[PDB]
């Protein structure tokens, strides 16, 4: 048993429904020494007295909010969540296994640059009784500061059947080096609380491996005259790491058959109706290609 946050505790049942489980002792936090009683969640049922209640924990009926009272007053609580080892492996009931990119993901992070600021997005069906604490550091054997900004719900969209809830956090590695070649991965540990159930989801990665650039900025067309052929041009996205002399990007100009150019321009043939889309990638490392920047053929 450990304290996930004030008056809230996680009980590790390795073996879930098996064995004796675990013997928890709760404590009423109050000066009061006399006539303390314990009740669980609602139930007027006194489970014990004394400033400490000692219980056994196997299933969810074992956890919940414990409350101590004296003379009809609530004195303090003690919410117990369970962390459950299902068939020898922790539970994941919470986050959606994000189209396996690839397999068993839950946390899909990415960075618009080597600044040391990445965002991780996770997916859930769950609309309510959801709490999400985000802890990030770089390296275990001797952690290294990552400030995490609290899990918002970045957007919510429909998956046809039922709604899909998209969370997200921003994180800045406190003292980061964009130029450097990372040797130690960031881990993002996500404390997933849904009601009584407790789950942790983790991601370890190098920023270089989660870089996905914003799409090219200011994509422009410029026809040649009495020519169904155009001067395409774009710019580095505002967010790309600077300087571009160092932090270079490579481009893909697809009309629609794509072409690749480490230049911010190319000359295509408008098949007037289609349009030119351009996307960038790290020029020097197979990170992820940004999204397309598209401009309608003239």
Partner 1 sequence: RAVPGGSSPAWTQCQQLSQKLCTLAWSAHPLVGHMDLREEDVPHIQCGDGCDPQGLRDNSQFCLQRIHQGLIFYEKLLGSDIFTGEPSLLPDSPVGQLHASLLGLSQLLQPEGHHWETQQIPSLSPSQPWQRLLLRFKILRSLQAFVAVAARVFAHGAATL
Ligand X SMILES: OC[C@H]1O[C@H](O)[C@@H](O)[C@@H](O)[C@@H]1O
Task: Give the residues lining the site for ligand X (CB under 6 A).
Answer: 273-274
Residues 73-112 that bind K ion (CB under 5 A): 92
Residue corresponding to tokens 């009495």: 226
Residue whose CB is less far from partner 1, 222 or 244: 244
Closest separation in Å from C-beta 264 to partner 1: 14
- Breaks in the chain (C to N > 2.5 A) come right after 256
Closest separation in Å from C-beta 185 to partner 1: 7
Asked whether position 285 contacts partner 1 by CB under 8 A, the answer is: yes
Phi, psi of 90 (to 5 degrees): -55, 170
- The answer to whether the beta carbons of residues 262 and 284 sit under 8 Å apart is no
Residue corresponding to tokens 């009272």: 69
Measure the CA–CA gap between 64 and 11, rounded to whole angstroms: 11
- Sequence-separated (6 or more) residues with CB below 8 Å from residue 170: 117, 118, 119, 148, 149
Strand partners, 132: 192
Partner interacting with residue 273 (select from ligand X, K ion, partner 1, none; CB below 5-8 Å by kind):
ligand X
Closest separation in Å from C-beta 274 to ligand X: 3
Residues 105-144 that bind partner 1 (CB under 8 A): 139, 141
Residues 178-197 that bind partner 1 (CB under 8 A): 178-185
Asked whether position 248 contacts partner 1 by CB under 8 A, the answer is: yes
Residue 152: name the closest of 172, 131, 137 by CA: 131
Closest separation in Å from C-beta 206 to partner 1: 7
Residue whose CB is less far from partner 1, 44 or 245: 245
**How many residues belong to the site for partner 1 (CB under 8 A)?**
31
Partner interacting with residue 274 (select from K ion, partner 1, ligand X, none; CB below 5-8 Å by kind):
ligand X
Angle at the Cα of 171 (from 170 to 176), degrees rounded to 5? 145
Asked whether position 89 contacts partner 1 by CB under 8 A, the answer is: no
Cα dihedral 98/103/109/114 (nearest 10):
-150
Closest separation in Å from C-beta 293 to ligand X: 16
Residue 148: name the closest of 131, 171, 168 by CA: 171
Instruction: Provide the binding-site residues for partner 1, judged by CB under 8 A.
Output: 100-103, 139, 141, 177-185, 204-206, 208-209, 242-243, 245-248, 282-286
Instruction: Provide the binding-site residues for K ion, judged by CB under 5 A.
Output: 92
């Amino acid at each position: 048993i450990w304290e996930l946050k004030k008056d809230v505790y996680v009980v590790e049942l390795d073996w879930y429904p098996d064995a004796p489980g675990e013997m928890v002792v709760l404590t009423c936090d109050t000066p009061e020494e006399d006539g303390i009683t314990w009740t669980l969640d609602q139930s007027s049922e006194v489970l014990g007295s004394g400033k400490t209640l000692t219980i056994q924990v196997k299933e969810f009926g074992d956890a919940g909010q414990y409350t101590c009272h004296k003379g009809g007053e609530v004195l303090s609580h003690s919410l117990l969540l369970l962390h459950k080892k299902e068939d020898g492996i922790w539970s994941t009931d919470i986050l959606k296994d994000q189209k396996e990119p690839k397999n068993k993901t839950f946390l899909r992070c990415e960075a618009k640059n080597y600044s040391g600021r990445f965002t991780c997005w996770w997916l859930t069906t769950i609309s309510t009784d959801l709490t999400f604490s985000v802890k990030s550091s770089r390296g275990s054997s001797d952690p290294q500061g990552v400030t995490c900004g609290a899990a918002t719900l970045s957007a919510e969209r429909v998956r046809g059947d039922n709604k899909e809830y998209e969370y997200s956090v921003e994180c800045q590695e406190d003292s980061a080096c964009p130029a450097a070649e990372e040797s130690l991965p960031i881990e993002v540990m996500v404390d997933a609380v849904h009601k009584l159930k407790y789950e942790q989801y983790t991601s370890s990665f190098f920023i270089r491996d989660i870089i996905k650039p914003d799409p090219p900025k200011n994509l422009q067309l410029k026809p040649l005259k009495n020519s169904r052929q155009v001067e395409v041009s774009w710019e580095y996205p505002d967010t790309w790491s600077t300087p571009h002399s160092y932090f270079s990007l490579t481009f893909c100009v697809q009309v629609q058959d794509r072409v690749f150019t480490d230049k911010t321009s190319a000359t295509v043939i408008c098949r007037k109706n289609a349009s030119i889309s351009v996307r960038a990638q790290d020029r020097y490392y197979s990170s992820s290609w940004s999204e397309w920047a598209s401009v309608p053929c003239s």
